[PDB]
Design a protein around this ligand. Structure first.
Ligand SMILES: Nc1nc2c(ncn2[C@@H]2O[C@H](COP(=O)(O)OP(=O)(O)NP(=O)(O)O)[C@@H](O)[C@H]2O)c(=O)[nH]1
Ligand SMILES: [Mg+2]
Ligand SMILES: [Zn+2]
Ligand SMILES: [Zn+2]
Lengths: 132, 170
């Protein structure tokens, strides 16, 4: 097995089959957490003073990393972050971005502007997309 | 933003991972991938409050090491899941109850009994059996179905309210 730390204070433990790349081991774990491998990179955690982690190719055989501890992190300057929800009364006519129904008293992300009902909160995408 | 550290425990194949992924993704995992250790984080709104759920999906038969006793110590609420078509999984609920009460060395640990796979017609655990076990514990009981997403939000939101009421001890 290999312990892999994932973005946003998450983690998972994957089984090691010889020949299976790191991409194929972490594909399901990333998709379930609303993450894409195209925006991430896998690192091998070092345990010294000079450097915390070393980048690995997504096609690296996971069998060559048994006994190590991996960490998946976002690439540099990716337009992904966490939402910042806040209560809002929509005086101007607004509709929920999930069910396309009338939204009078709901919630809104102060960054991306995602507006939704209370009972629609689970269907909101996990990652906040901000392209300025 | 307040945080709630939830722990999902139960026997193997009862649908612990299917209920969690259904909550944070609205997607039903049809395959069986046995869990080892998976931590998830999702922002939801429960009773008009922005909550940060930190869900820890555990394994069916987990190693009785210091790792298992550690997440039970830092867990604030526990979801006890059993399959209604698996009587042995319902019998294992008693062990999880007493195990959580011993590692935390306290009572009134927020807990919810969850009967999963209620969409199947081959029911072997009667609803009366689970309600009698839940009432003797003082914890709510909920029948869920990760396939059709029936009362999946009700299972986790109930556990969060149990933690809110437990945090008001003063
Ligand atoms: N019909 C039906 N099948 C379900 C339901 N929930 C889970 N399953 C099925 O049950 C199987 C096992 O599910 P899973 O979530 O992996 O169980 P688990 O408790 O996490 N097992 P483990 O502890 O080994 O990781 C899967 O094939 C899944 O599709 C449900 O509500 N209805
Ligand atoms: Mg599982
Ligand atoms: Zn946002
Ligand atoms: Zn809505």
């Amino acid at each position: 097995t290999i312990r892999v730390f994932l973005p946003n204070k998450q983690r998972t433990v994957v089984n090691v089959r010889n020949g299976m790349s790191l991409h194929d081991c972490l594909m399901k774990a990333l998709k379930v957490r609303g993450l894409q491998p195209e925006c991430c990179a896998v690192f091998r955690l070092l345990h010294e003073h000079k450097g915390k982690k070393a980048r690995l190719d997504w096609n690296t055989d996971a069998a060559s990393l048994i006994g190590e501890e991996l960490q998946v992190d976002f690439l540099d300057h990716v337009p992904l972050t966490t939402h910042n929800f806040a209560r809002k009364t929509f005086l101007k006519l607004a509709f929920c971005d999930i069910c396309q129904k009338f939204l009078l008293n709901g919630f809104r992300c102060q960054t991306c502007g995602y507006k939704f009902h209370e009972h629609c909160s689970t269907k909101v995408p996990t990652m906040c997309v901000d392209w300025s | 933003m307040t945080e709630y550290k939830l722990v999902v425990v139960g026997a193997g194949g009862v649908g612990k991972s299917a209920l969690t992924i259904q909550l944070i993704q609205n997607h039903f995992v049809d395959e069986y991938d046995p869990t080892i250790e998976d931590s998830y984080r999702k922002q939801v709104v429960i009773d008009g409050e922005t909550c940060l759920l930190d869900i820890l999906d555990t394994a069916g038969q987990e190693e009785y090491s210091a790792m298992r006793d550690q997440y039970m110590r830092t867990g604030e609420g526990f979801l006890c899941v059993f399959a209604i078509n698996n009587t042995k999984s319902f019998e294992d609920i008693h062990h999880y109850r007493e195990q959580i009460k011993r590692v935390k060395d306290s009572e009134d640990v927020p807990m919810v009994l969850v009967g999963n796979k209620c969409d199947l017609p081959s029911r072997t655990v009667d609803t009366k059996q689970a309600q009698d076990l839940a009432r003797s514990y003082g914890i709510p009981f909920i029948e869920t179905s990760a396939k059709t997403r029936q009362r999946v939000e009700d299972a986790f939101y109930t556990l969060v309210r149990e933690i809110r009421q437990y945090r008001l001890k003063k």
